[PDB]
Amino acid sequence: CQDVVQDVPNVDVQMLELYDRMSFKDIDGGVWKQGWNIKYDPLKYNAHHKLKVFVVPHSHNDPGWIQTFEEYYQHDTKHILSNALRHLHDNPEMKFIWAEISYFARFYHDLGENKKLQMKSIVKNGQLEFVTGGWVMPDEANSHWRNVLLQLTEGQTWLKQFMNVTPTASWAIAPFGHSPTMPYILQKSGFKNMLIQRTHYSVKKELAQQRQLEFLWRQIWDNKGDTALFTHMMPFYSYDIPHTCGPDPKVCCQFDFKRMGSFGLSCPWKVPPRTISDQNVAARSDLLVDQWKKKAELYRTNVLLIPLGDDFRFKQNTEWDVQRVNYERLFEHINSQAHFNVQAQFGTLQEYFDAVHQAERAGQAEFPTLSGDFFTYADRSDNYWSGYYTSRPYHKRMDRVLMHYVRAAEMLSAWHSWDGMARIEERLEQARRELSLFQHHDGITGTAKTHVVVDYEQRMQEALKACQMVMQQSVYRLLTKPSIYSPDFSFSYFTLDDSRWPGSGVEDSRTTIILGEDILPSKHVVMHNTLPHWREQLVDFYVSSPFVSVTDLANNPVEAQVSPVWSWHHDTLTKTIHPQGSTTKYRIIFKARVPPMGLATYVLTISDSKPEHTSYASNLLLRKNPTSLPLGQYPEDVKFGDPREISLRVGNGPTLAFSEQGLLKSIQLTQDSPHVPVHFKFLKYGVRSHGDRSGAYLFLPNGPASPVELGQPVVLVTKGKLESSVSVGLPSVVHQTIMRGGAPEIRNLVDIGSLDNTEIVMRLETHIDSGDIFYTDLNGLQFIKRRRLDKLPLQANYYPIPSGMFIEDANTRLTLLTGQPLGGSSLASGELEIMQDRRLASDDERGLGQGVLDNKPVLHIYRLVLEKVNNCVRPSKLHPAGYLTSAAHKASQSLLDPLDKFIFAENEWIGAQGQFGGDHPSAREDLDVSVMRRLTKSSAKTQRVGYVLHRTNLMQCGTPEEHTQKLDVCHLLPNVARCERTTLTFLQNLEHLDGMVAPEVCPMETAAYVSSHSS
């Protein structure tokens, strides 16, 4: 295994280093507004050394943005694809590339067989080429790597089945900045080349000057280079035709033949295209070849990529003709005039890359190595696209919830083969496709119109119901005596109970377990653990009595805590925000112990008085002017006091101190240790009243944030043996700190209400001497070092926080893990901050055509880990990566992949069993089974199950936490007959494994295995 900590890679371009050196001046470059006037030596090309030009027609099709997926399909995309089929069929030299398989699948299944055959033939002959082949062209900032892989797999599995092709070149012209997670996944999925576009204009200029726009993109920790993927960065401001022929858009626009008027389009530079004729083809060719040779100056080979397309292009037959016939006339002239020394043709993306690598192998170029990312994007001036790290945070959180239930549904159902009547594959396919769709760069990003957001939400809600169905059917099968099992595949044997989605205060969706002497004495509940190690975790349920005790299915008592059900109300009569307690339902909490990838059953039983093994939390309401809080049968009376500082400790865990406003002020890790200052604060950013306005994409604050005025908020303290909390009703946020004996959990119920032109930020203030350094993750996969740059504006120092962030000095680290992607930064030494929501009245001129005025309450979740790190083996000061500790990693897992909870729906479960998976290996803590997916339907004689295994890298800090069992996924199901290593999509076998054993993977590596079973 390569060491991902101690060896700093030697790369030609390291993006953090480049950032430190670059001046980012925004000067007028001339016709290339963000560049310079390019010059070329005309004698560079000659008869023995020609410029080879590939014009690559394309059409950018958003799977929802300003219209829904289905609306765009009906209005635009079905016509684009129908006319592509006809036009390519009839014009054999014409070419076209296609990226978004969601749309292509939607189209193809509506074709008659004759047209399906015609379509297969233009793909097989290379006229129509799929690029990337994902379901969508995903966002790269907010998306989790697991869902990037999911959508990639969804599209490529479709393409292999129906088109018999697997793309090896990726096309990502539209995400708002770019992540190294993409080449990581793509390189492990058979890819050889990728293309990107939306990078900071200053980066484009810098790399163009050095001819470093094509590079071997490796991971930041990769000393050897085995992760490298050849990458092409386009050089100009847009992917449209004016910005793809060359540096002068006034000239390039004249070669977009849809802009002569009858299509309703024109050239903003005020010179229209003219139809090519024999009288003008020489002059027109001179202009165009000059543009091409200038673009070629920015690259190292004599092979040039010229994209030819724009959003929802190639719709009308007349548009196909006007582009094709004019370009054909240009190519005939240019290629026959030896003095240009050019050979130009329509091509595909793979044709371009193949020709580049032929030039490379001929010794005509050597490419630089690069590591780093391409965040935060700015397309012009100070317009940094850090707003979309937060926009529409409800749906960002929903993404993470659905991510987990897709994993859990696929895993739980994979253990068996299912009859088709069970509709398992149907429901899983729907769930995967709806989550996959949402990875679009207008989905999870929060950059779509209101009604489109609603469509994505409705789709995801259906997907969650599909996962629930599959999960609960699977639990019933896994835990019922086989000779008793009698399934009705439409029935709900269990319902899922989720304490954090949509959340208390967002939706009252949880079911109470109703027990009573005259109705039902007890209830079975089941926990699932998707992670491949034993886990203990507190779980809670709502119950109709406080006098409830818990047993395991050996009837062993389990210690439990009962607490009230508190809900917060904005009392419009008193103009305060305060909690009310239920008088008929209560929360019971207990520790569930669940096998690796397994299930555990418990029983809740009512009694007529306090049970021996159940304790009751105390409750203290801090506010002036209190009024009573009755709690029905709950046996401890609420206590009241004036606001005051208070401290809490659960178990032998940290002691937390809180201000009189209910906000953390310090953490004491152990009995004698210092009370370390760690202060939460809520602040507000506003919007500029002159110049450019913040919107869904852009964050353009009117200076540093101002503190939220808190008034005298009401504080609720619950103190229990198993779980304690401090909750406070602040303006726009019910803020909660929860303690269970380790790192606290933070929950924010965020309701920005009608606060227009406001962004609410949560900041942590410490004494940690972090300087200008902080760490943020990329797609939940890796942590990258950030350096705050005072030469850039505030919004430029905001980065995606898809799963966590930290600051550290020599001795102390503070890590904030998130259950949802949000934007954040460290704007001063010792600080962390993360945006909660944003409400914006203006459009920000990027095409959305609305503000963000559709906010809804969202429950954001976090873990806060303060640690001593002086004994940890960390990377050197020059290394661009950072790594989590064990405790921080486990805290992230507790947010993203919690135990699932199931409540048996009927009164009696006949044949119930206590556990599943007790013989599953308990793997080392850094290893995960990211995906378990049965790949075959029940009719297949040889069943196949796919696994994706990911090993992270945790710091060595002198805490072994060892003896663990080897995990061989190929022996998790019986009767294995073959085990193969595959690409991450499962679509190509890479190694036949001896002994049918799937080895574990190296730190920071991800591998896929497929086991086959005879059984």
Ligand SMILES: CO[C@H]1O[C@H](CO[C@H]2O[C@H](CO)[C@@H](O)[C@H](O)[C@@H]2O)[C@@H](O)[C@H](S[C@H]2O[C@H](CO)[C@@H](O)[C@H](O)[C@@H]2O)[C@@H]1O
């Ligand atoms: C404001 O319209 C202009 O920009 C939008 C940009 O849409 C892309 O980028 C946004 C972010 O800015 C992203 O959210 C979205 O997914 C898209 O990737 C363009 O849609 C239009 S193209 C439009 O008008 C062109 C000029 O007339 C025409 O050539 C094209 O075919 C379309 O009709 C525009 O550039």
Ligand SMILES: *[C@@H]1O[C@H](CO)[C@@H](O)[C@H](O)[C@H]1NC(C)=O
């Ligand atoms: C799929 O593509 C490959 C390569 O051209 C070819 O061998 C095979 O005949 C095609 N059709 C299949 C495998 O069904």
Ligand SMILES: [Zn+2]
């Ligand atoms: Zn787009």
